[model samples]
Target chain A: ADTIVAVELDTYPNTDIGDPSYPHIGIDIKSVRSKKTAKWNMQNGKVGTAHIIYNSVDKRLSAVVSYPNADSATVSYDVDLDNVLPEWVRVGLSASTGLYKETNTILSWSFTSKLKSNSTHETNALHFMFNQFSKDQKDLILQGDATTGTDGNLELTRVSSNGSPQGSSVGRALFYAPVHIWESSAVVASFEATFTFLIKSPDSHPADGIAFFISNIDSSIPSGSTGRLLGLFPDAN
Target chain B: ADTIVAVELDTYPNTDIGDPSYPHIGIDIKSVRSKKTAKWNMQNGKVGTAHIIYNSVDKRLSAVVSYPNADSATVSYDVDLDNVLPEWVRVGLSASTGLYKETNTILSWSFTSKLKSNSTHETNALHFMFNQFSKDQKDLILQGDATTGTDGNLELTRVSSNGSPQGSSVGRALFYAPVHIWESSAVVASFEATFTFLIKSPDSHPADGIAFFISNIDSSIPSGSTGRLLGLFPDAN
Candidate 1:
């Protein structure tokens, strides 16, 4: 904790933004490809389209995406991770980056991760985290990988988008997923996942973020998104 | 499609290792001073905290957040944009940063935006697009805002960590919210909101991201971690 490796401002791209200078422990690889088309509509006071990007280091990789801000908006990703070993997996902070349609209007965000079981060892420990921005509204469920990516494959419960708690950060949902491979070691695997985002952007606009991770740890970890992941955000413990 | 206006990075900030352009969005923001107490016992195998950033430009804003990987996780924020105008928003694609707790386990992302308002403007005009290095995921909501952030409060959902799906990409689900007011010309308004996220990481430790925004419209904007505001990635309509 003394000389921590933090990357900020232009000084980035050359240093570890804030990742602990630990040895390369584990990894998780997933490709998010489009199904029908790649486009967003932002005209006449409406915006739509998915923003995608990729960043890389020695054993690290990063990708960022943002879609249009609209009511009943939908974003789906056909993901495939071929033979990746994840000691544990955590789905990071995900949000809607835009103004809502009205004042004090609540917005909801849901999540679902699925394993295709491309292999046997590819399945291990799995966790989940679901939360809400406002406590007065509906509650969010942070459910990790569970089903076979089917039609009714949902883990978290829905919340009320009726903007009640005006601007109160009501988040603290976490889930943990461990690749369940007790029978075999490292093996080639494949899984297809689809993440669909639905938003009601209030009468204003909205925007937010989402992150994926892989690591080598146990059940002693805390999953929170308030301060830093070094400790915990949704410390339900 | 010609020039990249805005983008979100969902991973740890190692800005010093590569491009300081995107990763810096989450780094330059003020650090999360609050340390996680004993909230660790909330769930199993939970680690780290959540970091959020927001940005506003020409009345347009964008935000981003990051959280540790867990069985289930939800990163959230709340905004008060009563001083600012409403009525426009958008979303982008979501990807990984090639970083993991294990290896080769692909993570997925999803979200739902809701708004509340007194006006009759359907806040469901929002749309989303999923474009990637090799594919795209895009769709739209022709309704109205379900939740409203009186003070510009917006929410984003997370990917369920249950690690199960019925199909590929198409196996995901998005729930809708009731109607409300998300916009207003009044002053001194506020909205409290919490977004729900579900994660399913297989052996991968979760890292969060930097959410900000950019625009050429309103200049009454600031820069930092979009904990509840817009990341301000860009203003390309």
Candidate 2:
């Protein structure tokens, strides 16, 4: 079983790009032989898909591009052995707005190369209950108000009265591996996963629910987002 | 919202066909213009798909056939106004096993054209917990050790030792008409549904879990299906 490569980026670009389309942070997948990129307009729902196909038998590399709701088009390229290096690939994100100072917020980003199927092997999948991680492993990374308690559970938000009135106190953790989910050119693979969690309120009301997201931003939480945004984006003003 | 058509046939052909494929039930979809059929051997784990496409624009009718984990193929033809009756289209199942006998069983089947997201119109979806069904609807159907008490709950099996050891009593129900689900050929529609039920034993031991099924068999529990079969099919032998 190969480790699946997954990546995600959460961004909140408040500024509007009215004219020529430029200045956008987008997810990118790069290899020594080729690169595939997918971009989305944070304002509107426009999206694109970039695919990289490596044919090892004939030793050819191909890049397939597809817009939202459109068929994919491919371009083939050849590369020398030296082009495939030690860290043969990279999957992260980059963005530039030129003169626009949009809010451009990214909530969280992580990737892994794990197939999303039930596995008999423990090393082949990602499974986490609140009580599973060790104390030393708990020190990996903590952003915003996220914390690990003595109960071994990672708390994304505190239960105190210190939360922002609008949308304050965001916590995010990123797993830094690239996990592959599904490839368009491959056979139709079915993946099933189950998530179990409990949400409690101090009294009667809970402000909002939590979202388990998979995205391409490697490791960053978007800034200036709290309350109703669900830490997805910054304020839109 | 369009009515989603769903049907299935379960067959256990105890008799054997030496050379050819025999003793199996299958699913099919046909139109005035064309027909699409999908068949599977009744022995192993098998499945099929039957799709209907009614193109009102050019007065055409089409049937699309697909098996699970396979690509869909279609056959389209023109339908005259005479063939197009009032809401005139149908979706169901059929089977033929030559001279061999089989007990084909359909585990569960349901089709609804309702989008799975939150519903603004409560009548457009099917949401029922154990305590939700009305009292007047309880006495509609009951057979072979099945009953509903004054509590207004349908009891397919009893908590006592009143069941047979081999293949004892079975209970089944059918619902007709009054349904819709998304179609594949046309719009980018989505359907979301959730099933929630509970199973409890009198003490620590429970005989077998329940089966929530959808099928065109229509309100008839297969004969001789009690203990482990959960009233789905008769004994294979």
Candidate 3:
């Protein structure tokens, strides 16, 4: 792949080759394995379009893919192209398929690069895409007992010595980097976040539950928030 | 339980008595059955407190329960006390214990009613609680194939005739009654919503997913969103 630092769409899953999942947007660095991925379903038998943008200063790459009648997906990945690709190299839209084959067609390709090639490609905030990812995202913050799985699934709570959850475990996975949610009492943006998760109970009686929350609470898990609290309430409450 | 109308905290689940899970704030009308419930874990062996408010005009009951060191839970329900209780009745804090019990304790109780006992108890928007339910909420809106289980779980997608989810099924459950989300170019409110959900796939291949979303898109599910689209995008996209 010529030291390829590329991002594209997928229509199939070849787990033996280490594909992330299915119908995803993958940002790959040289290797066949995808270092970052977001799920996107390409419309069947329709002409869809995609646009990609990269800002060298922030090392944040954003891609928007959509069909004329559907909602589009805005995805972000942080990477430095200089570290992955040769200085003088060709830029192209290419594809590959072995036993797995779907007509990878490009009826029309409109690829453009606004490379400053000098003082870093700098710009103001792009409003339409999820653009909060930065070059400093290597060390993500995991609050409470939250962790990552072998395949990078966000594990909000930990499991125990025998692979069962320690009683009353609470966890939250937050990016150390902050996103602009509000400013000057005027909402700065409107965005949508999509994620996949699985919650299993090793114990037969599932006393508690899980929730996705947004709050102004600064730090720390309140004490005594176990059992059926879902980590939201403390025992004293 | 003399023709009672109660909204209280539950520490145990007497499933045999149709208790809906555990450690929840339940709204009950006469029968032991809880028509509405919100999970709230009391701090372990500490003094916790709860406050409840009901608007006679809207028939929306709001409750706030908390511990000193943990986060609190604000829950809401729609019910009319006039339809269920006697015209001249008593208001008090009460509890019960059977073969299964935890020491239910109340150190102090302070309650006041500014009921007008008249004029529909009219008021402005209450900021601290989830106060959107109205007297006109007998009919809830479930867009797409969303449905409610016999035990009241919100199922966002429909299954096949054989209890397997129909392929490409997309669902959304909305209140139908609009809430104030924006105004005069300024965001109107800050809120926290907590819910419990379960996702299951009867088919071997689970292609698509689900999400909690907010948007300005009004009326109609975009056409042709199945599989990995999660009903958010249309096939043409």
Give the per-residue lDDT digits (tens) of candidate 1, residues A1-237.
111111000100111322222211111122111121212232222221111211110111212122333322122222322224332343322221112211111122233332312222122323332223433222323332111112222212122334221221222223333333212222211111113233333433322212223222232223332222221223211
Sliding window of 10 residues with minimal summed lDDT for model 1 chain B: B165-174
Candidate 1 segments whose C-alpha is farther than 4 A from its true place:
A1-161, A164-177, A181-184, A203-207, A212-224, A227-237, B1-237
Query: Given candidate 1, what's the lDDT at residue B215?
Result: 20
State the displacement of the C-alpha of residue A202, model 1, in Å, after optimal TM-score superposition.
Answer: 3.7
Q: Give the TM-score of candidate 2.
A: 0.31
Instruction: For candidate 2, write residues A85-158 as lDDT tens digits.
Output: 22122232222111111111222222223221112111133332232334454423555655544244445554
Which lDDT tens digits does candidate 1 get at residues B1-237? 111123333333333433232222222112221111111112212222221222111121223222333222222222333332223323222222122311111122233333322222122322222211111111322111111121221112222335221111101112222212134421111111112223233444433332222222222222332221222222211
Error of 2 at B77 (Å): 17
Error of 1 at B147 (Å): 63
Give every collision pair in model 3.
A67-B237, A70-B234, A235-B42, A235-B43, A235-B44, A236-B43, A236-B67, A237-B66, A237-B67, B160-B164
The prediction achieving the highest DockQ against the true structure is: 2
TM-score of chain A of 1: 0.33
Interface RMSD of each: 15.8, 14.8, 22.5
Question: What TM-score, computed on C-alpha atoms, does each candidate reach?
Answer: 0.23, 0.31, 0.26
> How many angstroms is residue B170 displaced in model 1 relative to the true structure, after the best TM-score fit?
40
Q: How do the residues A136-161 of candidate 3 rate in per-residue lDDT, one tens digit apiece? A: 32434555665554333444555554
On TM-score, the leading prediction is 2
